[PDB]
């Protein structure tokens, strides 16, 4: 009873380890046989990904540079240059460090290779406007577009046409050298045209597209900006190889195999979960009830695996997060059923603005709350999932993982 809870926590903890930067790199990079390497690592996981590459390659790296969030770097790595910069918004340090990265990659020859180690936050952490466009203008134009209700693709079209590195321009500067990118994806569906706005990915959108977006949302812009946009972005790239070394699929696969390794009939139901968090908790609960009482779509002992990135339409003023709402909603749906554990987790280690990664619940959780005089629906209505789970000993606390590939959910039935 106690032990099944422990079993699911271990599976969740060990599944996430499969996408820690160190292990993700070491399980991929050696197979690629890289030589004459300039290492460029950008992202919230930049420092650990760089350290792991150094250990694989050593002096085959001729120069290394690291840009990550303030407070994220963990000291020297041989003689690599270690930098930190603005996130979630780019600042003067972003400009400085990006400018330095372009000094490291210009005038390389066909025989050289850039090892591009990429994780979350790269739109903010990797940026240098085109000559005559200001960072402020970029900050302001983005915010104007968001507020006006522009789509992420429309924001992206405009951003790529204001930048020296987005929209494939980075790969274009590395030319004639090769780009081999290792990507640790925090974007659902691992869309490389969106991840960091595709600095080593061709930009299918045009200057015309960018200007039509601004016109569409009535956003006024300088002459400087409009004539910066007229410089078309690379429509094709010949010097790039991309490998996804971490994403939500890898994490689901590892949980599937860890679960099998423990005697469970295990399957992945989906890795593209994106609906409302509380409604997803009920759907998953309904599947668990099918297994429990009808022994399908898996026979007991069963392990159902889910991955994705749910959302919460915030109506109240509580504290919580998507994974904690998904768990709290499920505990309501599973009240009174023996033999069921559900465990949800942000692979961050951080669900909402909290120290918890998610929830760990069963058929007693809701009645533990009722027996204390609390009402589970009221915590959910008020978006106060964190507190409901703390009161019933159902918070999953992992700590920061040093990675982010969205959400893992696991349901066990016996």
UniProtKB/Swiss-Prot annotation:
A GO cellular component entry from the record: cytoplasm
Enzyme superclass (EC): transferase
Keyword Nucleotide-binding: yes
InterPro entries given in the database record: GK-like_C_sf, GK_N_sf, MOFRL, MOFRL_assoc_dom, MOFRL_protein
Keyword terms: ATP-binding, Kinase, Nucleotide-binding, Transferase
UniProt effect for mutating residue 44 to A: Very low residual kinase activity
Entry EC no(s): 2.7.1.165
Catalytic reaction equation(s): (R)-glycerate + ATP = (2R)-2-phosphoglycerate + ADP + H(+)
Self-association and partners: Homodimer.
The protein's role, per its UniProt record: Involved in the degradation of serine via 3-hydroxypyruvate. Catalyzes the ATP-dependent phosphorylation of D-glycerate to 2-phosphoglycerate.
PANTHER family registered for this protein in UniProt: GLYCERATE KINASE (PTHR12227:SF0)
Protein name: D-glycerate 2-kinase
Lineage: Bacteria, Thermotogati, Thermotogota, Thermotogae, Thermotogales
């Amino acid at each position: 009873p106690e032990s099944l809870k422990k079993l699911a926590i271990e599976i969740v903890k060990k599944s996430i380890e499969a996408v820690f930067p160190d292990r993700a790199v070491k399980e991929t990079l050696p197979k690629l046989n890289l030589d004459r390497v300039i290492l460029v690592a950008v992202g919230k996981a930049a420092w650990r990904m760089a350290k792991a590459a150094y250990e694989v390659l050593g002096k085959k790296i001729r120069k290394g540079v690291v840009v990550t969030k303030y407070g994220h770097s963990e000291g020297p790595i041989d003689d690599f240059e270690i930098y930190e910069a603005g996130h979630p918004v780019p600042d003067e340090n972003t400009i400085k460090t990006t400018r330095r990265v372009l000094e490291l990659v210009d005038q390389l020859n066909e025989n050289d290779t850039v090892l591009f180690l990429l994780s979350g936050g790269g739109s903010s952490l990797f940026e240098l406007p085109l000559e005559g466009v200001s960072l402020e203008e970029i900050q302001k134009l983005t915010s104007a577009l968001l507020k006006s209700g522009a789509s992420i693709e429309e924001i992206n079209t405009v951003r790529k046409h204001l930048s020296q590195v987005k929209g494939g321009r980075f790969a274009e500067r590395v030319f004639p050298a090769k780009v081999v990118a290792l990507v640790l994806s925090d974007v659902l569906g691992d869309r490389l045209d969106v991840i960091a706005s595709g600095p080593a990915w061709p930009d299918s959108s045009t200057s015309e597209d960018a200007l039509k977006v601004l016109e569409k949302y009535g956003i006024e812009t300088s002459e400087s900006v409009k004539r910066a946009i007229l410089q078309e972005t690379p429509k094709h790239l010949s010097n790039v190889e991309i490998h996804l070394i971490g994403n939500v699929q890898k994490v689901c696969d590892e949980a599937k195999s860890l679960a099998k390794e423990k005697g469970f009939n295990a399957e992945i139901i989906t890795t593209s979960l994106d609906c409302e968090a509380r409604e997803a908790g009920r759907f998953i609960a309904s599947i668990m009830k099918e297994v429990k009482f009808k022994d399908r779509p898996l026979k007991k002992p069963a392990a159902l695996i889910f991955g994705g990135e749910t959302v919460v339409h915030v109506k109240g003023n509580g504290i919580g997060g998507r994974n904690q709402e998904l768990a709290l909603s499920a505990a309501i749906a599973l009240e009174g059923i023996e033999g069921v554990i559900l465990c949800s987790a942000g692979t961050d280690g951080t669900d909402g603005p909290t120290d918890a990664a998610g929830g760990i619940v069963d058929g007693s959780t809701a009645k533990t709350l009722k027996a204390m005089g609390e009402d589970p629906y009221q915590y959910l209505k008020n978006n106060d999932s964190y507190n409901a789970l703390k009161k019933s000993g159902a918070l999953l606390i992992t700590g920061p993982t040093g990675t982010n590939v969205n959400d893992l959910i696991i349901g066990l039935i016996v």
